[PDB]
Amino acid sequence: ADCAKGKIEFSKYNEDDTFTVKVDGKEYWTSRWNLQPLLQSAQLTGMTVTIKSSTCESGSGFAEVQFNND
Amino acid sequence: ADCAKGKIEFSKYNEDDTFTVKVDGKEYWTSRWNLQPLLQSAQLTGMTVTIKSSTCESGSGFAEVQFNND
Amino acid sequence: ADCAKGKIEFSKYNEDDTFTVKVDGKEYWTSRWNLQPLLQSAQLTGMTVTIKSSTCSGFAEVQFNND
Amino acid sequence: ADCAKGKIEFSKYNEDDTFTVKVDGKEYWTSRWNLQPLLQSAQLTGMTVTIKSSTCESGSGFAEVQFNND
Amino acid sequence: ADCAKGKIEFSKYNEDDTFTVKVDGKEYWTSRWNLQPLLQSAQLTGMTVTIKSSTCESGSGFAEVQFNND
Amino acid sequence: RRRA
Amino acid sequence: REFTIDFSTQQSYVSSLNSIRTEISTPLEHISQGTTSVSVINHTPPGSYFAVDIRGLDVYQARFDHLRLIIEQNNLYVAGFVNTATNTFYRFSDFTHISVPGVTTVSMTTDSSYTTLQRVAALERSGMQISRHSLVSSYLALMEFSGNTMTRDASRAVLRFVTVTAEALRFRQIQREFRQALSETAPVYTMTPGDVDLTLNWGRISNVLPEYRGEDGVRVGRISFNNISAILGTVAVILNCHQPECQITGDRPVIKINNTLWESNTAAAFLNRKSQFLYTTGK
C-alpha cells in the first residue's frame, strides 16, 4: 500500500544497519542499504517520497519507495 | 532502440532491488546497481536522460542510459 | 541514550577506516562505512545530528534533522 | 598524456559495462565503477576534468582523470 | 602528523585506483576508495581538509584526513 | 527540454 | 506592448535591450548597482506577450524592417515570428495559447524547443556563428518562409534571432559577447558552450538568485559566480519564482555552504553516493 507521501521529517541510521525515515508523521525502516544516501539526499532537498509497504502503522518496514518531483 | 529522452518524472526503488524511472510518460527499470545514484542525481538536477533498450514499451528493462545537460 | 545533539564541527576519516565526528564539543567514531557519506553530507548541509548509543567511544545510531 | 581537458558534455553507461564521457568534443570510456559517481558529479557541477592516458586516441579507455573546480 | 591543511586544489583518480589530492601545494595519494567521493565533496564545497600521515613529504600516501567547514 |  | 531591438550599433542594441528589461522586470534588491541589475520578470497572466520589431540590420536604414518576434512575457520564449509585410504570424506548436489580434495566425507543426530547432536546422548552438551578415540572411529566410512546418533555413534564422534577442535579454553575458559583431569591424560572434549552458540553466538560476544575500559565491549546477560583478556581468533577467521552470524537484531553493549559495539539488546530487568500496564491489 502507499503508506505515506510527503517530505522526510527526519532520518536515522540504526544500530542494526537499517535506516529509518519519518514521513507524514509516521516512522518506517528499511534494510535496503542502497536507499540510505538516496533517502538522505531526498531529505536534504525536501523531495517528496512515497513509502510503500504491507503495513502502514508507524514502525513498519519498507523495501519500496518512490521519489517524486512534487 | 532510443526508447525515451526526457527528464526523470519519478524514480522508484523496487522490491526486487531494481530501480525504475519514468521518462516521457513511460516506465523503465534497471537492475544495474551502478545506475541507482546516477539516475537519482539526474532526477535531482533535471538532466535529460536517454533510455536505450531493445524494447521501448512501458515496463521494459534497460542497462544503457545517456545523461545530457541539454 | 542521546549522546550528543548538534552540528558536526568536524569529521575525520581514520587510518583504521573508522569515521570520527565532533558534535557539541565531544568526539565520537563509527566503524559503519555507510555512515561516512551520511555524516559528511550532514556536515556540509548543516544538519543537526543526534548521536545515540548505549555507552555515550563508538556509535552506530544517529538521527539526521534538517536545520 | 592529457587526452582532453574541459567540462563533461555528456556521460553514458553502456550495456557492455563501460562508462563514456565526452570532453572537449572527444569521447572516452572507463569501466572503473569508482569513476562513475566522480565523473557524474564532475559533470553536474561543471568541474574541469583532464582525461589522462598513455594513449590518447579516440574512443580509447582511461582510468586516470584530474578534477578541477575551474 | 598534520602534513597539510587547506582547500583541495585538485583531485585525481589514478590508474592503480588510488586517489590524489593537492592541498597547500603538496600532493598526497590514498588507496582508501571510501575517501574518493568524500574528498570530491570536500573539493566541491571548499572544505578545509587536514592530511594526516606519518610521512608528510609530497607524493606520499595518507589514510587519515579531517574535514572542516569555514 | 529548453524551449526557445 | 511593442518594443524595437535596433541592431544598428552596439549602443542602439544595448539601449533596446535595457529598455525592454526596464519595462518588463523589476530589479532584485540585493543584485543591483545603479540601473544595472538582475531583474525579475513582473507577473503577467499566462498568454501575455510582447512584440519585438527587428530594426537596424542594415545600420540606421529603414529596410529589412518586416520581422517581428512574438515573445511570451512571463518566460521570454519566442512564440513565433510575424511577417508584417504579409501580416502573418508563424506560431510554434507549443504556443497555441498565444493569441495575437489582427494577424493571420499560421499554427505550425514544429515546436520551439532547441532540440527540435537544432535538428531541423542541422545546426548545433555550441559553435554557432552569428554576424550582422547572417542576421540579414536570417531575416531574409524568415521573410521567404511560408507554410505550417519549419524549414532548415527558417530554423537557423530562429536559432540566431532567439540567441540575440531573448537570450541576450536574459543574459548580459550574451549581450556583451554578441554586441561585438555589430561594430564596423563586423567580427563574428561564436556561441560558446558556456553561453549554451547559461541558457539551459536559466530556470535553475532564477530559482536561486532571489535568495542571494551577498554570499561569496553562487553555484547552480555547472554555473559558478564568484562575486556580484560576475553575477551582474552574466545575468540580467530571471523568471518570477515566487513558473514551472523554477522547480525541478523538492522544495529547498538553496543551501549556504562555506559562504557559497548552492542550488540545493546540485549538492543533493553529489551527496547521494553510498560508500565507494561498497558501490564499486556490489556489481
Numbering used by the authors:
A (entry chain C), B (entry chain D), D (entry chain E), E (entry chain F): 1 to 70
C (entry chain B): 1 to 56, 60 to 70
F (entry chain G): 7 to 10
G (entry chain A): 1 to 242, 257 to 297
Copy text from the publication:
All Stx proteins consist of a catalytic A-subunit and a B-subunit pentamer. The catalytic A-subunit, which is a member of ribosome-inactivating proteins (RIPs), has an RNA N-glycosidase activity that cleaves a specific adenine from 28S ribosomal RNA to inhibit eukaryotic protein synthesis.
To elucidate the precise manner by which these shorter peptides bind to Stx2a, X-ray crystallography analysis was performed with co-crystals of each peptide and the Stx2a holotoxin, which were obtained via the soaking method. We were able to determine electron densities for AR4A-mono, R4A-mono, R3A-mono, and R2A-mono, and X-ray crystal structures were solved to final resolutions of 1.80, 1.80, 1.90, and 1.75 Å-resolution, respectively. These structures reveal that the AR4A-mono, R4A-mono, R3A-mono, and R2A-mono peptides bind tightly to the catalytic A-subunit. In all cases, the common Arg8-Arg9-Ala10 motif (numbering reflects residue position in full-length MMβA-mono) interacts equally with the Glu72, Tyr77, Val78, Asp94, Ser112, Tyr114, Thr115, Glu167, Arg170, Thr199, and Gly203 residues present in the catalytic pocket of the A-subunit, whereas the Arg8 and Arg9 residues of the motif electrostatically interact with Glu167 and Asp94, respectively. The amide group of the Ala10, but not its side chain, interacts with the Val78, Ser112 and Arg170 residues. The main chain of Arg8 of R3A-mono also electrostatically interacts with Asp70 of the B-subunit. Overall, we find that the binding patterns of these shorter peptides are almost identical to that of MMβA-mono. We found that R4-mono, AR4A-mono, R4A-mono, and R3-mono exhibit greater inhibitory effects (relative IC50 values = 0.387, 2.27, 2.70, and 3.68 µM, respectively) than non-tagged MMβA-mono (relative IC50 = 8.14 µM), which was used as a positive control to compete the binding. Although the precise mechanism of the detrimental effect of the C-terminal Ala is remained to be elucidated, the presence of the amide group of the C-terminal Ala may contribute to fix the binding manner of the peptides with this Ala, such as MMbA-mono, AR4A-mono, R4A-mono, R3A-mono, and R2A-mono, to the same orientations which are clearly demonstrated in their crystal structures.
